[PDB]
Design a protein around this motif. Structure first.
Motif, short mmCIF file in Angstrom:
data_model
loop_
_atom_site.label_atom_id
_atom_site.label_comp_id
_atom_site.label_asym_id
_atom_site.label_seq_id
_atom_site.Cartn_x
_atom_site.Cartn_y
_atom_site.Cartn_z
N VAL A 191 0.63 -1.04 0.08
CA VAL A 191 0.20 0.10 -0.37
C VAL A 191 0.80 1.40 0.32
O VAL A 191 1.73 1.20 0.86
N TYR B 288 3.41 5.08 5.21
CA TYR B 288 4.16 3.31 6.06
C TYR B 288 5.11 2.78 4.76
O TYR B 288 6.41 2.58 5.49
N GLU C 177 8.78 4.98 5.34
CA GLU C 177 9.01 4.24 6.09
C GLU C 177 9.88 3.20 6.25
O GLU C 177 11.20 2.92 6.07
N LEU C 178 9.45 2.48 5.80
CA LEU C 178 9.42 1.07 5.63
C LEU C 178 11.15 0.75 4.30
O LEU C 178 11.35 0.26 4.82
N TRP D 160 -5.08 -11.33 2.47
CA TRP D 160 -4.59 -10.95 3.96
C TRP D 160 -4.17 -11.99 4.42
O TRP D 160 -3.94 -11.79 5.41
N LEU D 161 -4.21 -13.35 3.96
CA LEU D 161 -4.12 -14.74 5.15
C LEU D 161 -2.73 -15.18 4.23
O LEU D 161 -2.02 -16.19 5.37
N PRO E 14 2.60 -12.30 6.90
CA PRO E 14 2.90 -12.74 8.82
C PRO E 14 2.00 -13.15 9.19
O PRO E 14 1.65 -13.98 10.40
N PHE F 30 9.89 -4.68 10.09
CA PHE F 30 8.69 -4.43 10.00
C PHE F 30 8.40 -4.83 10.84
O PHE F 30 6.68 -4.93 11.06
#
Ligand code: 23A
Ligand code: 23A
Ligand code: 23A
Ligand code: 23A
Ligand code: ZN
Ligand code: ZN
Ligand code: ZN
Ligand code: ZN
Lengths: 321, 323, 324, 325
Positions: free
Chosen positions: A21, A25, A28-29, A178-179, A182, A287
């Motif tokens: 996305v 964020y 930053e990552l 979404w599964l 992590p 992460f």
């Protein structure tokens, strides 16, 4: 707690940056992955981490089908890592990135990293892809035995890190992106790969091997009893080639870390299954936030003696520091 | 402990017997699956089990691709079960077998079992196969919503039992057949199916649903924190249809049993994650010995008050056996 | 598990035998006597059947600590120690010994410990709580000044001190009046020993002699479960403790103490201890002949801990502690 | 967690204030006094900031139990109960009350309990261990015969009895001589209360009055950890115990007792208790003003237990026990 050792701490080179996305964020990552001497070191100083064993991000090398390019990228990532560690050798150690889609090349690079660069182990993101890259290559296969023999010879740990399964081997997750990652897919993929190594008899042949799993063992401790003892009334020897039980290899050849699994209940179960002597502190930065990992670990409900072992001495012993 | 309730206790009929290494062990398992009034009852009497909620073996109906046939076998298995329970209604209860490869047919069979046969729930062996049977059919799909609405209306629990994935979906196990089944594959398959139901928003639409998982939750308790909290620094909302977190649905709509997972450490972890009020005793007989399950549970390291709840009252409450 | 080490295993000599009479129903007195006097026969067969390689023996209780006359106390201690040395010599590959000490006479006790360790090869001392001396109406605790020289010698010799239970004197037992069933192992033993331990800690003994190793049986006499409260009660009061010691009770407990599983075969209790003091400081023990060896061993073999810890608690922690 | 119920929350009246002086340094005495006398202000603000909806109040210690003159004891108990009733009436939606009882006079204590429950709406009693009476040199434990009628009335009224700590008398404290820092909450409080509880159990009191509900603070005063040993020590001796009770200590502890988290904010301890007595019999409590409310709440909100149990221990177990639903 001060003087902790953390060993699932990642970085990236521009070549592998995309492997991890749109918005603040992601920006930053990216910064975190490329930074080693600034933000990262300041957080280590503020959150009691003396030693950080660095490793390339995922899937990185394991997702490069062309062995030629895989070898090149691995060598590049390792040289950069060596250069970064040299800046603060009192704080940074390194895990080698390996081009396992080419067994011999991987063995050679591990030797170079350990013997010439002083690396203290290897970190690999699950199965390798090679050629058309549509076939997951697991390390329990025959072509990797010589490699494992060398790992045992060099006597350095092998960190089996997660990666997502190939699309054709992920139908159970269809409609549920979404599964993946992590949330769950990472754990299943890694836990089974670990079980494959055990079942293959790899640890009978090379009993001195030290395998490390993050995320508190990818779920293995909770189900370990069932893995061996299911249908106990059937008193027939196990069918797999390994000479003993899964719990035997897990208890004797594995170590697990707290990376991305800051849960006290989970830690207690692990302490009562594998033992505090085989659990290591780790964060999974960038992460996961370092303060999140450290604040949780500093207050988790265990004996102070075990907080010292899990946070520092287990790792210093394992890596001969 | 006496007066226990066990609910992952299987039986088979000739038609499904095969779903379950020649020798004395295979012969014994067959006898066990076909027996209900003799060996099974004697063991219940010797190991403090008052109530046994029976269910057909696996994969059974879920592995029958032809709708008509699946409907036939399920109906047959349910009629057989109904007849066996009627012989000793004070000791045996039943879970319905459902032909979910046909949503409407499955809904009607559940109604038939619950309303006319007095069944107390349904037990399904994971995804269904239909047509060419090359596609695993998960119950979070839209076509199953009417079914779930009925399950909630009837207000009976749904036991999501394991099954192995299809070969094309099990390459990670290639060369390691010993990793399929109860060793590991069963847990992964069921845990993910459970998570799919959760992520789909099914429990927002039907919040009163009660789902039961065996083998101590198929690994879910230990990793539940991570499922929702991984990469916590990223404060962006999850994009799944569900309105809340996985832990919310697991904690509010699920119950787990001790079937085939007689490990005290695992039970303690579960008690500290989902709570003793949502853990139920079960054995997985005939795949597990009843004495193994009972001897372990009678002495596991928990509060006596919780041994009573997990061994009996949680189930009595869930299946409305006290009124 | 085989090759276990057990260290709260008792025996008696004729002179102390009667001290154990009032701890079991008369119907079991004959058997208990036989057990206490037997070292080479039944005891060894039980060790072989229940995976116990090494048994560190100690005299029964209260024994020497209940002999008010110094001369007599010194006499019985020496005799009990000489007998123990003789018995260990008959099977040196299986038996080790803890010294009995006449602590009602500090100097004599210091000398007897040196003799036991330097001349008899004993690996530590086991004392049944406070001592009685003179009129014997006052419990003598070891945090008192006169015992500092003794503790200095214990640290010098570098051998552990097992602080075993004993019942409080009648005048100090009113809370149990009308409830004789609360005395002994049921409860009184634990309270008496836990507080004695806390007295040692609060006195600053471990600031002065930081290398001391104290051992407590019965899973720490209740200390682990309440340790947080012992230091942290009324935490809002940001003022230093009032006792002489420089640090917290938890510091001394974590650094100077070890606990054994004697007479406390409870998995929940062991899990709590593991999460409080750690597996590295918990040792297997039975409390034979007051507890059955098979009861202790069968429970420990199956308790819910990591196999790695079962090996440490059952064998290696003790082998490390006693330099075996 | 919001909506919590706390039940070992103290206050004092001028007549009992000095009883708390010796348990805090001179520098903190002024603050402790303010806390003990305050009920409507500071206390309520802390309850609002730390998710506590209901606070069941009780007088401080040893208070009434340390007044040997029966007449004075009855007078002080009544005065403390009237003040408490007056305070609760100011905010009945937030405060409930435990009765103070003059147990050095069994009949008077029974009558005062009846008055508090039937006329003042109190929900139970809180007593600081043994009573002193007359010359006051003998600890009076409640397992004694003269208290049986009282217990029968407690069961009839069907309200819980909170057995709170107190220090032993000096002549019964020689083991602590030279170590005043071991008296009080550090240790003496626990030993005194744990044994008093065991005396009640051993006496057969719960065979005669099985519906009694006894509450202990500080996570059971150490009982859970040693409960197995209390009954099973020397298990090879196959002969019944010598006490009058018909069953085991664990049976009475499991069936007639409840423990609170007062002054024992330790996760390991809570886990052991959950595996011994069960989450259904553990209740949140703070021991304010001797413990900070935020210390108790912050710890409890994050302790490592199932969320379902956090709701039970923090609120619903108490509401069920005190019939608040
Ligand atoms: O290594 C951890 C990790 C890697 C890729 C992506 C991700 O979300 C992760 O948490
Ligand atoms: O239901 C349990 C079960 C079913 C088929 C096979 C097996 O091994 C099992 O344990
Ligand atoms: O040492 C243990 C012991 C000693 C005397 C009495 C008793 O009951 C015991 O358990
Ligand atoms: O109730 C608790 C309490 C009472 C008096 C004194 C003290 O220190 C306390 O902690
Ligand atoms: Zn990682
Ligand atoms: Zn099953
Ligand atoms: Zn002993
Ligand atoms: Zn209080």
């Amino acid at each position: 707690m001060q003087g902790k050792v953390a060993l699932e701490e990642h970085f990236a080179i521009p070549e592998t940056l995309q492997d991890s996305v749109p918005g603040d964020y992601w920006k930053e990552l990216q910064h975190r992955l490329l930074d080693i001497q600034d933000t990262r070191l300041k957080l280590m100083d503020a959150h009691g981490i003396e030693t950080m064993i660095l490793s390339l991000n995922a899937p990185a090398v394991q997702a490069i089908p062309d062995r030629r390019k895989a070898i090149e990228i691995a060598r590049r990532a390792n040289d950069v890592l060596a250069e970064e560690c040299a800046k603060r050798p009192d704080r940074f150690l390194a895990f080698a990135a390996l081009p396992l889609q080419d067994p011999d090349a991987a063995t050679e690079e591990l030797q170079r990293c350990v013997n010439d660069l002083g690396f203290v182990g290897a970190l690999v993101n699950g199965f390798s892809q090679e050629g058309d890259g549509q076939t997951p290559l697991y390390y329990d296969l025959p072509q990797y035995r010589p490699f494992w023999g060398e790992v045992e010879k060099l006597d350095v740990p092998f960190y089996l890190h997660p990666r997502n399964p190939l699309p054709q081997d992920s139908r159970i997750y269809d409609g549920h992106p979404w599964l993946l990652g992590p949330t769950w897919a990472f754990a299943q993929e890694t836990a089974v790969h670990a079980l494959r190594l055990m079942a293959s008899g790899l640890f009978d042949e090379h009993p001195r091997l030290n395998i490390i799993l993050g995320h508190m063992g990818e779920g293995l401790p909770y189900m370990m009893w069932r893995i061996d003892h299911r249908n106990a009334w059937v008193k027939l020897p196990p069918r797999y080639p390994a000479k003993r039980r899964f719990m035997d290899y897990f208890n004797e050849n594995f170590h697990i870390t707290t990376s991305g699994n800051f849960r006290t209940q989970t830690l207690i179960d692990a302490i009562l299954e594998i033992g505090a002597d085989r659990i290591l502190f780790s964060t999974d930065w960038p992460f996961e936030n370092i303060d999140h990992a450290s604040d949780w670990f500093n207050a988790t409900s265990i004996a102070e003696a075990d907080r010292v072992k899990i946070g520092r001495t287990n790792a210093r012993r394992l890596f001969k520091l």
